[PDB]
From a paper:
[name] ([name]) participates in both biosynthesis and salvage pathways of purines. [name] [name] ([name]) is present in solution in a dynamic equilibrium of monomers and biologically active homodimers. The addition of the His6-tag on the C-terminus (C-His-[name]) was proven to have a negligible effect on the characteristics of this enzyme. This paper shows that the same enzyme with the His6-tag fused on its N-terminus (N-His-[name]) has a high tendency to precipitate.
N-His-[name] enzyme was incubated with GTP, IMP, Had (hadacidin, analog of Asp), and MgCl2 during crystallization, just like the C-His-[name] variant was. However, clearly defined electron density for the Had molecule (HDA in the PDB denotation) is not visible in the structure. One additional sulfate ion is found in the active site exactly at the position, which is occupied by the 6-Pi group of 6-P-IMP (IMO in the PDB denotation) in the structure of the C-His-[name] variant. In accordance with the missing Had molecule, in the N-His-[name] structure, the Asp-binding loop (residues 289–294) is moved away from the active site (Cα of Thr291 moved by 6.1 Å) and is poorly defined in the electron density. The electron density blob in the supposed Mg-binding site did not fit the Mg ion, so the Ca ion was placed there instead, as it made a much better match. The calcium ion is coordinated with six oxygen atoms: from α- and β-phosphate of GDP, the backbone carbonyl group of Gly39, the side-chain carbonyl group of Asp12, and two sulfate ions present in the active site in the places of Had and 6-Pi group of 6-P-IMP. Since no His6-tag handle is visible in the N-His-[name] structure, it can be concluded that it is too flexible to be observed, and obviously not so firmly bound to the protein as in the mentioned case of G. stearothermophilus purine nucleoside phosphorylase. The buried surface area between monomers in the structure of N-His-[name] is 2422 Å2 (as calculated with Pisa, version 1.52), which compares well with 2342 Å2 calculated for the structure of C-His-[name].
Residue numbers in the entry:
A (entry chain A), B (entry chain B): -1 to 411
The structure:
């Protein structure tokens, strides 16, 4: 247990990771995004001002933090440049790994094309196809932008390899021209931020500096251990934070699992505790469970402790942050899935195939007014019973409770 | 830091991981292969009998051990069944993850095709292309073989999708019918071994059972942090052992880095300490550096402490095993690369681009007769000083010393 703490979403994303990272970031020297891409959307709100970050790490509102975009991330350079322009004096407080892979316009076109047959429900941003080119070892990395010679060589090889797909993926007649001009525009803007971030973090850890690792997506979206194939293409577990930053597993200190008080997922795939009745629509409305751009409605349902115990085991959570209790204000009865029923069998442990798994619910008396509460003793007795039940059943202590989007509407326990 | 120990190769593979795992496995309840495929070849020798293992974990010679092939591995079913047939009574001591992905004949054909332009020097076994289909979320997994109907639907989608490539990858006209029969032959043989190994290791961790995780390839072949693109398509460091196994970073106890007393790599890519003179041929001859399918001569060179210190930081090694000291018997002067130089500038730290990096060598007086020695006190003084230098420079204690292929020719310190 060295100096590196990890924030991980333990459901299917959108749990409130951005809020928690921004709440705690001021006490860290480094804040690190370690996987995924701009498929992520992490929303921070403070004093009535909202920021929705996609690749920019969530320490950006504290100019003393050094924000790192690490090697297992996939980068859309134009979108990252558009984020950089929203903040002042990022030059010595944002660093992008020279080993991170680059998302090309072909990637999103391929994503949309494959989605016609696979119907996973991806964000159509080309995340998966970028990771495919990484495994092929044909992908372009951010360090390649530092030398026009190699970038040209690599683009030309890309140009020759995508030609049998120009018709299938609707690439266009100006693909080569437009891509070459894309890098002419964006490479000069991003190049000063490209660094060996592996060495930076190896040295920071050896020097005992405080490092916060910001997960994206959620544990149940993990490429290996999630609800495959309804998953993202990166590993999302806490150990993924070591795999590609330079830090080793023995550096990991606290593992903070972020869970909502109910469940959401966006996109297709299994969802044992989903609620498609008007009560599920109530959760969506009161929880504002729509896209970052307010477009993609989420599937909504109840908290699922079978899946939470599984995710907590995969990450080694030492604490939980319980988010959005205020969305449940005014609901008369709150259900929690405590086990699955499968063809007469009661399953206490999350199975590798959720086929025929029906939720078994325990019901809790509802509460009225948790919104904005900042003190434990101000919480209603019924909410405190709900919180106590979760800690006891999952076996991980709840150390943070959020009661609104606002940074300071957070109780520390 | 609980009960899971990790053995990791800290160079470019072939360091002696199979020997070390077999030497220590008897004291463990589980022995787990966690990434790669049958590109691995782990050689164990005991009492003049050799076993060359490819996907079989190296606990197989102790029937009380439970051997696990975990979820991030890629499985060639035919080759695994051929390994199964060489041992007696594997049924309750070998378990294959229902989440592991399956290598199809298409994959090796695509591998050879892409190699014509990329010239990485892969093993041509389809490892990379299998990982690509994983990222695409179109890949077939071991659990799919347990249900005839699901396997049918997935093989159909695969046949459809590979239509455009039948000519380009030299797929036969009999591809569909051959693969159909392949699974009719091999799925019955492998089905009894398919299990939810994620749940097995979650429970093993919770019960405090002793787990040994066996890495494949080596740290400098890591897809993210190795000598890209001259790497394998999986993560190879100790953190990968708790990404996809059902363990988590807090479970990792000892991390044993396996290093040869000199260096090899097979395939193309940078190699700062390579020796292409007749002394390099001598290392190849004396070290039998030709592989399992003895038709792949290795590139050889000297120990590189710059790369070694980098690999130890990425893995968090707590002890080192120094292998093949006996290969250096009779060499008058042993070189160790202690630093790099780049265009006249000295570099202490392993850089992200090895272009123009040349070795700075310190030389050591050689020895004559380390072969087969079993007590530290019986080693020649020059051997002892070489060992002390490595551990002092790298900062990790050398706790195992190997002096021949035989299991028992191993010194414990
Ligand atoms: N009502 C309420 N909203 C919250 C709370 N915490 C976060 N929010 C908001 O809920 C949304 C969280 O979804 P998102 O930002 O996608 O989560 P992330 O991806 O894990 O950072 C955002 O709109 C936050 O502003 C909370 O405790 N109560
Ligand atoms: N001369 C000598 N050979 C060894 C020693 N340890 C292992 N070997 C052999 O060296 C080879 C190691 O390469 P390999 O099996 O591919 O290593 P792995 O992939 O890391 O298990 C094998 O042929 C082993 O039998 C040693 O200490 N001395
Ligand atoms: O922003 C996120 N919030 C919630 N789910 C996401 C997010 N980004 C990707 N996913 C999910 O991850 C899966 C794969 O999408 P991809 O990451 O775009 O490939 C789908 O289920 C997505 O909805
Ligand atoms: O058996 C191994 N020993 C040494 N190198 C290996 C082994 N397996 C794969 N590699 C190396 O890993 C790289 C990629 O090969 P692939 O794993 O077949 O994709 C090449 O440099 C290979 O030589
Ligand atoms: Ca989100
Ligand atoms: Ca080997």
């Amino acid at each position: 247990s060295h100096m590196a703490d990890v924030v991980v979403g333990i459901q299917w994303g959108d749990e409130g990771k951005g809020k928690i990272v921004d709440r705690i970031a001021k006490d860290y020297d480094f804040v690190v995004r370690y996987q995924g891409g701009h498929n992520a959307g992490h929303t921070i709100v403070h004093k009535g001002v909202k920021h929705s970050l996609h690749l920019m790490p969530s320490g950006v509102l504290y100019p003393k933090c050094k924000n790192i975009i690490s090697s297992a991330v996939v980068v859309s350079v134009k979108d990252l440049c558009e984020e950089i322009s929203a903040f002042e004096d990022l030059e010595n407080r944002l660093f992008v790994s020279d080993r991170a892979h680059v998302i090309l316009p072909y990637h999103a076109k391929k994503d949309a094309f494959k989605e016609k047959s696979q119907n996973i429900g991806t964000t159509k941003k080309g995340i998966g196809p970028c990771y495919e080119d990484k495994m092929a070892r044909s992908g372009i990395r951010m360090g390649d932008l530092l030398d026009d010679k190699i970038l040209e060589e690599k683009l030309n090889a890309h140009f020759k390899a995508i030609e049998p797909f120009k018709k299938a993926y609707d690439l266009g007649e100006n693909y080569e021209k437009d891509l070459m001009g894309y890098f002419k525009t964006y490479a000069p803007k991003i190049c000063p931020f490209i660094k060996d971030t592996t060495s930076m973090l190896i040295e920071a850890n050896q020097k005992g500096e405080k490092i916060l690792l910001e997960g994206a997506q959620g544990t149940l979206l993990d490429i290996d251990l999630g609800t495959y194939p309804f998953v993202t293409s990166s590993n999302t577990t806490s150990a993924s934070a070591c795999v590609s930053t330079g830090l080793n597993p023995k550096a990991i200190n606290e593992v903070i699992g972020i869970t909502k008080a109910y469940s959401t997922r966006v996109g297709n795939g299994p969802f044992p505790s989903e609620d498609t009745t008007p009560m599920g629509d109530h959760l969506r409305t009161k929880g504002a469970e729509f896209g970052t751009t307010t477009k993609r409605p989420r599937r909504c349902g109840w908290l699922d402790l079978v899946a939470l115990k599984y995710a907590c085991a995969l990450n080694g959570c030492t604490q939980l942050a319980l988010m959005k209790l205020d969305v449940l204000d005014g609901i008369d009865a709150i259900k929690v899935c405590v086990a699955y029923e499968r063809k007469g069998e009661r399953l206490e442990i999350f199975p590798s195939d959720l086929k025929d798994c029906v939720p078994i619910y325990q019901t809790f008396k509802g509460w009225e007014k948790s919104v904005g509460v900042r003190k434990l003793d101000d919480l209603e007795p019924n909410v405190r019973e709900y919180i106590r039940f979760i800690e006891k059943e999952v076996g991980v202590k709840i150390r943070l409770i959020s009661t609104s989007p606002e940074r300071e509407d957070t109780i520390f326990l």
